[PDB]
Amino acid sequence: SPELMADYLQPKLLGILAFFNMQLLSSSVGIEDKKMALNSLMSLMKLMGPKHVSSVRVKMMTTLRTGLRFKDDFPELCCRAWDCFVRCLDHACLGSLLSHVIVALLPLIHIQPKETAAIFHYLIIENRDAVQDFLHEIY
């Protein structure tokens, strides 16, 4: 079952994500392979579902930040993947994403003006009433 697969993914929990993060951390893993792993991480996050990812999704965002640290060609795909991960993530609280969403947006804006803008517009729409709670915080 995809839900059964999600339950198996839930049993792996942070450690499977940590193993992916460790592979992302390693210099040896190929950037295209890392991009495939990032696509896999987005697929795994989808398989878990937003509620299942929970704190691990925030850990995944930290892993995404490690992915952000070396981006190159992968980053334009990664920025779409990060936007997809945000889209996969429950809107929850805009304030709860806080700086990490802003930090991702700033990296995305450097990679392309449009990629950050598309993510920001999606983020604002998803945040809804929550959106602008952190707008003052993200001066």
* DSSP-derived secondary structure for 43-91: HHHHHH-HHHHHHHHHHHHHHHHHHHHS-THHHHHHHHHHHHHHHHS--
Resolution rounded to one decimal, in angstroms: 6.3
Method by which the coordinates were obtained: cryo-EM
The amino acid occupying position 75 is P
Return d(Cα 23, Cα 124) in angstroms, integer.
32
- Scanning the structure block, which residue is given the tokens 């990679």? 111
